[PDB]
Design a protein around this ligand. Structure first.
Ligand code: HEM
Ligand SMILES: O=C(Nc1ccccc1CCCl)Nc1cc(C(F)(F)F)ccc1-n1ccnc1
Length: 462
């Protein structure tokens, strides 16, 4: 069709697109399976069409460095719009160019290393709440689904970190916070909705005037109201480690508005709830099928925290094997699966002409299992991230949190949150593979990096 011969004139290989659909039919295997096959059959640079949208893939470490870091403010500044956003266009994940840069500056100090340390005692409380709910799950003598136990944990962490709500979601699934926020699940970009708007981007402005938000409108307006109360409450109840409080005090001394305040608060829930629980589920699956890793990690946790001591910001950064377990799991399962930037002008990178409007993509999943940089990619070997080999890995091939000024702003919080859970659970429980566990864990064929069957493991007390 119109914009389907763009990669032909540039001499770029790629699967031949069909009219009106591009290469969306190749998504039947999923985003990750399609990327790895394209890397095999086309090399280092290829392209395809998400409907009429041309998507160029790059794997050269210097080319990835130029897109994400070097030429970021100039050319590759924003991501591809994904659907009707509504009032959430003021979200840092969705804001573009000047709005994003102002929003990121107004939100960067919220994620300081010092501000993270002040949150450790609060996140530590629900690790004990996690163990209690895990104890009854282990005494029943039946396998436990990790997504629910971790999903209850991440919900408890997000509510207590974003706001002052302290709850036990696993035992009290009726609080209005836990009810609505449980519907903030990841976007399956290969579902009937997102596939249609990817093929039909002209429908996105139509859905906006219909006030059809991509986020559940009930959750958004409820959170828009809940924040308004808590704000007024803390005002007429002046007494704080809260993402809300860290943004309210910064509102005093461009500026952050009240609706922009709510949008970022919702982002942290959406970015934190299903994302953290998935990775924690992925980590524990690998610890069960590789008990040697689970053993050396339990020993190191006891070595740094004797008598099942409470973790600390200083002690968490001390355990070297725990960081290796998390890093390797993220390599095998980078839940982003992809990094995208919109080319805002005609620019040439590393001897490649990139026309305006093309979506440049970094296939994180395809790079993490590409043999050219990893030996035995399909095997779970945490020793790749030992101190000696930690310097022999190219940071622009292994990008679980992205790179450049638009990387994951909550990287340290997410790593701290997951490790605080792993420390408190491993030093009290051991995870054994039961019968229902899928020994060859199959990944979904959709737009999410989640397991095919929910991960169920046997839990026992030490
Ligand atoms: C293991 C957990 C997590 C992983 C693997 C992860 C991964 C990512 C990735 C790959 C990106 C895109 C970066 C890129 O485009 O270069 C991103 C963006 C982002 N993440 Fe996360 N993330 C995690 C947890 C979190 C948490 C807990 C928060 C809450 C504070 C968060 C907040 C954000 C935000 C706000 C952005 C947008 C940053 C920007 O556009 O300027 N993430 N994350
Ligand atoms: O940007 C990303 N990448 C990413 C990262 C992990 C998994 C999936 C993906 C999307 C590619 Cl399937 N996720 C994301 C998106 C939004 C919203 F789209 F709503 F703006 C809001 C928040 C986040 N988030 C989640 C975790 N960390 C940031």
């Amino acid at each position: 069709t119109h914009s389907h011969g763009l990669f032909k004139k540039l001499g770029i290989p790629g699967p031949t697109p069909l009219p009106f659909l591009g290469n969306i039919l190749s998504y039947h295997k999923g985003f990750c399976m399609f990327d790895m096959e394209c890397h095999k059959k086309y090399g280092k640079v290829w392209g395809f069409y998400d409907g009429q949208q041309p998507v160029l893939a790059i794997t050269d470490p210097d080319m990835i460095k130029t897109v994400l870091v070097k030429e970021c403010y100039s050319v590759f500044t924003n991501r591809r719009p994904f659907g009707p956003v509504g009032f959430m266009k003021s979200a840092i994940s969705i804001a573009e160019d000047e709005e994003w840069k102002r929003l990121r500056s107004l939100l960067s100090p919220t994620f300081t290393s010092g501000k993270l340390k002040e949150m450790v005692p609060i996140i530590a409380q629900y690790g004990d709440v996690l163990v209690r709910n895990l104890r009854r799950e282990a005494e029943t003598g039946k396998p436990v689904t990790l997504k629910d136990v971790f999903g209850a944990y991440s919900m408890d962490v997000i509510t207590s970190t974003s706001f002052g709500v302290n709850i036990d979601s696993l035992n009290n699934p009726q609080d209005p916070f836990v009810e609505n926020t449980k519907k903030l699940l990841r976007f399956d970009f290969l579902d009937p909705f997102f596939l249609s708007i990817t093929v039909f981007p002209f429908l996105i402005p139509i859905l906006e005037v219909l006030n059809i938000c991509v986020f559940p409108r009930e959750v958004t307006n409820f959170l828009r109201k809940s924040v308004k109360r808590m704000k007024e409450s803390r005002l007429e109840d002046t007494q704080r480690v809260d993402f809300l409080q860290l943004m309210i005090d910064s509102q005093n001394s461009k500026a952050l508005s009240d609706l922009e305040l709510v949008a970022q608060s919702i982002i942290f829930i959406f970015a934190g709830y299903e994302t953290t629980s998935s990775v924690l589920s992925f980590i524990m699956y690998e610890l069960a099928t590789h008990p040697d890793v689970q053993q050396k990690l339990q020993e190191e946790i006891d070595a740094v925290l004797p008598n099942k001591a409470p973790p600390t910001y200083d002690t968490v950064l001390q355990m070297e094997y725990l960081d290796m377990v998390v890093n390797e799991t993220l390599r095998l399962f980078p839940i982003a699966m992809r990094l995208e930037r919109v080319c805002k002008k005609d620019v040439e990178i590393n001897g490649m002409f990139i026309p305006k409007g093309v979506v440049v993509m970094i296939p994180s999943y395809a790079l993490h299992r590409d043999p050219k940089y990893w030996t035995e990619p399909e095997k779970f070997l945490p020793e790749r991230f030992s101190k000696k080999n930690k310097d022999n890995i190219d940071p622009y091939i292994y990008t679980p949190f992205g790179s450049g000024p638009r990387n994951c702003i909550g990287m340290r919080f997410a790593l701290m949150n997951m490790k605080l859970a792993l420390i408190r659970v491993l030093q009290n429980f051991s995870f054994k593979p039961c019968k229902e566990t899928q020994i060859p864990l199959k990944l979904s064929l959709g737009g999410l990096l989640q397991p095919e069957k929910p991960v169920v493991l046997k839990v026992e007390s030490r």
